[PDB]
UniProtKB/Swiss-Prot annotation:
Record localization: Host cytoplasm
Effect in UniProt of substituting residue 11 to Q: Complete loss of activity
The enzyme's E.C. designation: 3.2.1.17
Protein name: Endolysin
Consequence recorded when altering residue 20 to A/N/S/T: Complete loss of enzymatic activity
C-alpha cells in the first residue's frame, strides 16, 4: 500500500466533471476544480488545468497526471507549513500517509487548525489523538473515510485499507 493507492481508494476515479461531497465541482481523482456553482466556471478551470478544450471530460492519463501534481503539492504544502512539518517529520511512514490524506482532502489550512490532535500525534498518544480527531466536522460529514484515516493514525498499519 502507498499514498496513491490509498487516496485512489478514498477519492475514487471519475473522468467527467462531478460534484464532490460538499457539492463542488471536481474531476478525476478528487481534483477540485472550483467552489463556484457555475458549471461553466468549472469547465473553464478544467481546460486551463489540462491545457486543452475538454468539454468537461478527461482521460485516465490526464486524471492521473492531475493526481500526481496534487499529491506532490500536498506533501510540499505540509513541508512548508510550520505547524505541520514538525509533526509530520516525527511520524513513521504509514502515519505519514495518513497526514498526507487529510491534507489532500482538507487543505493545509484545515489541518493546521487541528492543534490539539497535532500535538497528540507529535507526542505519540495514538488513542488519544484518535478520539480527538473524531470530534470534528470532518468525521461527522465523511465518517467512513475519516474512520479509515484515523485508524491509520491510530495503528500505524494499513488494516483499514485492508
Ligand atoms: Cl494542472
Ligand atoms: Cl466517507
Amino acid at each position: 500500500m502507498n499514498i496513491f493507492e490509498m487516496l485512489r481508494i478514498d477519492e475514487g476515479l471519475r473522468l467527467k466533471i462531478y460534484k464532490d461531497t460538499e457539492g463542488y465541482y471536481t474531476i478525476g481523482i478528487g481534483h477540485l476544480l472550483t467552489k463556484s456553482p457555475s458549471l461553466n466556471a468549472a469547465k473553464s478551470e478544467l481546460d486551463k488545468a489540462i491545457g486543452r478544450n475538454c468539454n468537461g471530460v478527461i482521460t485516465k492519463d490526464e486524471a492521473e497526471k492531475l493526481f500526481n501534481q496534487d499529491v506532490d503539492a500536498a506533501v510540499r504544502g505540509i513541508l512548508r507549513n510550520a505547524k505541520l512539518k514538525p509533526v509530520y517529520d516525527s511520524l513513521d511512514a504509514v502515519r505519514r500517509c495518513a497526514a498526507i490524506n487529510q491534507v489532500f482532502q482538507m487543505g493545509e489550512t484545515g489541518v493546521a487548525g487541528f492543534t490539539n490532535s497535532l500535538r497528540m500525534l507529535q507526542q505519540k498518544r495514538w488513542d488519544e489523538a484518535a478520539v480527538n480527531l473524531a470530534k470534528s466536522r470532518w468525521y461527522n460529514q465523511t465518517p467512513n473515510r475519516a474512520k479509515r484515516v484515523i485508524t491509520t493514525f491510530r495503528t500505524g498499519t494499513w488494516d483499514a485499507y485492508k
